[PDB]
Amino acid sequence: RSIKTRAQILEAASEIFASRGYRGASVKDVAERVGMTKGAVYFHFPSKESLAIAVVEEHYARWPAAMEEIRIQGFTPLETVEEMLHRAAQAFRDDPVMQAGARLQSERASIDAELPLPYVDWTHLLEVPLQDAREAGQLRAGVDPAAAARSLVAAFFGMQHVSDNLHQRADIMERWQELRELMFFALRA
Amino acid sequence: RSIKTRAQILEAASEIFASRGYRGASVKDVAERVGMTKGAVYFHFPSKESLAIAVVEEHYARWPAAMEEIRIQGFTPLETVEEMLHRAAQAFRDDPVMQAGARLQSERASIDAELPLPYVDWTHLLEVPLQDAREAGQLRAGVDPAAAARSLVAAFFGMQHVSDNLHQRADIMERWQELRELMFFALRA
């Protein structure tokens, strides 16, 4: 199937899923947003569930490329972890793909399909530069990179989730900054 | 209305809400668990929504008393914060009242009633001993007690939520320990 067409549908679906959640979203409204028939959307995503799965997978997909870009910007392994989470905070503030993936994952119990497991992709992703930081002497003695990865992913998720629940992520950058300062003070050698 | 009767109903409702969530719970099943008629439960909670609100309020209610008890155990203000969160981790592992309050709050978007605002009660609760820690010189210079309270509540929530989603809180004490070590390393003077 056409990558152009799939990307169009996924962008519209992310806007609608982020704005309305799973139940308020309809394949009919996705089709209208992209100027396609219902049948053209079902050809690519035969069910609303398959569309939700695809949106969730897509909101994890850009991050390995982002981590390579950050290393080319000259950041150390430990700084790379910090910059990844900063970009993620910005994406939660601004990007319907990120907002939709997290909203669908929060509605996980009531979507009748196996969504990708949450948290594990980011945990594994950050463990590698944390391990590189350990090998370079950049991590405080006694800090286990795998534990640091779990703690960062959990704390970041909590921060952005609280910010969404109480303030629609209006304050997310200020909440991340204060949490970031604490956590990275505790990680740096 | 009788406090004995309300407590009985709230204990049964917490077990059923934690086990099944809001939709799977029924006033009928709550009544059966306590050996009361449906009408006796509706006399005390006229709607399923009013029962959910009460369960959420109750899962916040024990914590001021717990904080006073911890101070009598001889803990400093900063240690009191650590011990409060440790007790909360244990409660999330073991206590249907805590599990039900958090499950209802996660199902917040799809319960047709104004539940208590999440996170704010714990944030305000921990800010007071954090401020006492600041005044006693127990907090690292530059750490704002209100920022520390927000960061701890967000990170703790995230940790327990990840543990519930992926492992049904089986590993919650090990996940809290590793997060606790980082965060309190960064808070202590």
CATH number at residue B15: 1.10.10.60
Based on the domain organization, do B176 and B157 belong to the same domain?
yes
Is there a single domain that holds both residue B96 and residue B162? yes
Taking the Cβ of residue A151 and every Cβ of chain B, the question of whether any pair is shorter than 8 Å is answered with yes
- Nearest-CA neighbor of B84 among B111, B110, B62, B58? B62
Q: Which pair of tokens denotes residue B130?
A: 């954090």
CA-CA distance, B69 to B90, in Å (whole number)? 16
In this structure, what token pair is assigned to residue B113?
Answer: 């009633």
- Are B105 and B25 members of one domain? no
Do B173 and B119 belong to one domain?
A: yes
* Method of structure determination: X-ray
CATH number at residue A152: 1.10.357.10
- Type of residue at A113: A
Q: Are residues B67 and B124 in the same domain?
A: yes
Q: Which of A94, A150, A148 is nearest to A121 (CA)?
A: A150
Contact B128, B121 (CB under 8 A): no
Q: Do B118 and A153 touch (CB under 8 A)?
A: no
Torsion of CA A112, A157, B152, A128, to 10 degrees: 130
* Amino acid of residue A8: Q
Q: Which of A55, A79, A95 is the last residue of a domain?
A: A55
- Count the alpha carbons within 13 Å of A48 in the hemisphere toward its beta carbon: 16
Q: Which two tokens stand for residue A121?
A: 């992709």
Look-up of token digits 């590189």: A132
Residue B188 pairs with which residues in a beta bridge? B139
Q: How many domains does chain A contain in total? A: 2
Same domain, residue pair B160 and B67: yes
Token duo for residue A12: 């519209």
CA B108 centroid distance within chain: 15
How close does chain B come to A29, measured CA to CA in Å? 21
Which value, in Å, is the radius of gyration of the alpha carbons in chain B?
Answer: 18
B143 CB within 8 Å of a chain A CB = yes
Same domain, B48 and B80: no
HEC states along chain A? CCHHHHHHHHHHHHHHHHHHHHHHCCHHHHHHHHCCCHHHHHHHCCCHHHHHHHHHHHHHHCHHHHHHHHHHCCCCHHHHHHHHHHHHHHHHHHCHHHHHHHHHHHCHHHCCCCCCCCCHHHHHHHHHHHHHHHHCCCECCCCCHHHHHHHHHHHHHHHHHHHHHHHCCCCHHHHHHHHHHHHHHHHEC
C-beta of residue B63 within 8 angstroms of C-beta of residue B97: no
Q: Determine the residue among A114, A139, A185, A188 to mutate to test chain B binding: the one whose Cβ has the most chain B Cβ atoms within 10 Å.
A: A185
Please compute, for residue B79, the number of CA atoms within 13 A of its CA located in the half-sphere on the CB side.
Answer: 8
CA dihedral for B164, B166, B169, B175, sign (positive or negative): negative
d(CA A155, CA A179): 8
Does one domain contain both A29 and A104? no
Pick left, alpha or beta for residue A183 (phi over 0 → left; psi -120 to 50 → alpha; otherwise beta): alpha
Q: Note whether B29 and B48 are same-domain residues.
A: yes
Whether residue A143 contacts residue B185, with contact meaning beta carbons closer than 8 Å, is answered with: no
Other CB atoms within a 10 A radius of the CB of residue B166 amount to 16
Residues spanned by the domain of B169: 58-187
Same-domain status, A65 and A49? no
Give the Cα separation of A116 and A114 in Å (integer).
Answer: 7
- Do the beta carbons of residue A31 and residue A37 sit within 8 Å? yes
| Whole-angstrom Cα Rg for chain A | 18
In terms of domains, do A36 and A115 share one? no
SS3 of chain B: the string is: CCHHHHHHHHHHHHHHHHHHHHHHCCHHHHHHHHCCCHHHHHHHCCCHHHHHHHHHHHHHHCHHHHHHHHHHCCCCHHHHHHHHHHHHHHHHHHCHHHHHHHHHHHCHHHCCCCCCCCCHHHHHHHHHHHHHHHHCCCECCCCCHHHHHHHHHHHHHHHHHHHHHHHCCCCHHHHHHHHHHHHHHHHEC
**B162 reaches A (C-beta below 8 A):** yes
Which of B110, B120, B182 has its CB closest to that of A151? B182
Are B71 and B142 members of one domain?
yes
Residues of A in contact with B89 (CB under 8 A): none
Verify whether the Cβ–Cβ distance A162 to B108 is below 8 Å: no
What one-letter code names the amino acid at B29? D
Look up residue B67 and give its two tokens.
Answer: 């904080």
